[PDB]
């Protein structure tokens, strides 16, 4: 599909199957892309997985997952907020479905446009660039491998 990176480079990538958009110290964003027709280099998103890693005192680990024809307004455990009932550092709201991870100044918008899924991520620069050496495959940071474009 089309990708707009944290570095404002716009790319058209095949990236068929499961691929990490974000893989850092605070968040995992994983997508599944499918060829629009068999054998096509044009691919589109049918699954969006977001892992909000446990942040002690703010949120327990939460997983959000949307698929084509299933965009819930809750995490996989049926919750709409991280941690306790009083803890609102992590929440989900329906409109787009939106995830507000205030604790990491991060917003994630997910919607279904036709048969496929779209994604928008707003993240603070210091947190977006906070990842270990081995976390070198992140479509949002470095874009796609040259062979995928």
């Amino acid at each position: 599909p089309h990708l707009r990176t944290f570095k404002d480079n716009f790319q058209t990538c095949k990236v068929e199957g499961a691929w990490p958009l974000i893989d850092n110290n605070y968040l995992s964003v994983q997508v599944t892309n499918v060829p629009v027709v068999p054998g096509s280099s044009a691919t589109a998103t049918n699954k969006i997985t977001i892992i909000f890693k446990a942040h002690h005192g703010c949120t327990d680990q939460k997983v959000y997952q949307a698929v084509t024809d299933d965009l819930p307004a809750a995490f996989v455990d049926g919750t709409t907020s991280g941690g306790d009932s009083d803890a609102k550092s992590l929440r989900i709201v329906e409109r787009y479905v939106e995830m507000h991870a205030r604790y990491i100044g991060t917003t994630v918008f997910v919607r279904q446009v036709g048969r496929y899924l779209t994604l928008a991520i707003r993240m603070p620069e210091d947190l977006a660039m906070s990842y270990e050496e081995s976390q070198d495959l992140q479509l949002c940071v470095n874009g796609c491998p040259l062979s995928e474009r």
């Binding site: 803890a87 550092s89 928008a120 620069e125």
Partner: peptide, 16 residues
């Protein structure tokens, strides 16, 4: 207290 302490980076993935 949990709330993040200033510039934002944006990422997008969409269809074709």
């Amino acid at each position: 207290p949990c709330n993040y302490h200033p510039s934002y980076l944006f990422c997008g993935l969409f269809g074709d």
